[PDB]
A and B are shown apart, each in its own frame.
Chain A
């Protein structure tokens, strides 16, 4: 019911962004979390799924940030570390609640996290 993300992260390209998806309102251990990227004005793009009980981080290979999805079971917070940042990674990163069984629905999500990857500082 509640997924709250760490705010916008502005980096230089090649640097690292890690983004927190904080669960509340449901059971973290009973749901995988999908991680969904929307490039600004572009389509929905799914970077990986994670498991609460395990290192269940699948990764889509369309782009590569050396990403690893870490879930903090005490705080129910899945992280997405997106490294090797590129100006195209600039986007709104959604985390999406996934089923734990091999059925894949994202009913409820984070609020999205804009990351501006540029040599242009804020």
Chain B
């Protein structure tokens, strides 16, 4: 909520599309990520108190999932490469500066 910077979209359906299932997403996780934190977990998503133990079972889930990219993808189905500029705005040295006059 305190991030100062970017969110920027563009269609990579013109490029990233194939069949590319390497593209992936976290469909479910048990909390929100901390500021700028990532969740790398390939761990089993555990729905019941029955431990899955690294195999599939009743409501045994791998939480991360993939987007099948269908080269007929439309505006709702197109991937958007998206970028976000982290910065604190002020209170630290100029790293990215402005083009000074």
- Do A and B touch directly, given a CB cutoff of 8 Å in the complex? yes
Number of A-B residue pairs, CB cutoff 8 Å, is 3
Roughly how many angstroms separate A103 CA and B80 CA in the complex, as a whole number?
12
Q: Please name the residue on chain B nearest to A102 by beta carbon.
A: B9
Q: Please name the residue on chain B nearest to A56 by beta carbon.
A: B7
Chain B proximity mask over A80-106: 1 for CB below 8 Å, otherwise 0: 000000000000000000000011000
- Which A residues touch B80, using CB under 8 A? 102
- Which A residues touch B9, using CB under 8 A? 102
The DSSP consensus for interface residues of chain B is strand
By size class, the interface of chain B is under 10
Roughly how many angstroms separate A103 CA and B9 CA in the complex, as a whole number?
11
Roughly how many angstroms separate A103 CA and B75 CA in the complex, as a whole number?
9
- Which A residues touch B75, using CB under 8 A? 103
Chain A proximity mask over B1-34: 1 for CB below 8 Å, otherwise 0: 0000000010000000000000000000000000
Roughly how many angstroms separate A103 CA and B77 CA in the complex, as a whole number?
12
User: Could you show 3 A-B contacts with beta carbons less than 8 Å apart?
Assistant: A102-B9, A102-B80, A103-B75
Q: 3 nearest interchain CB pairs?
A: A102-B9, A102-B80, A103-B75
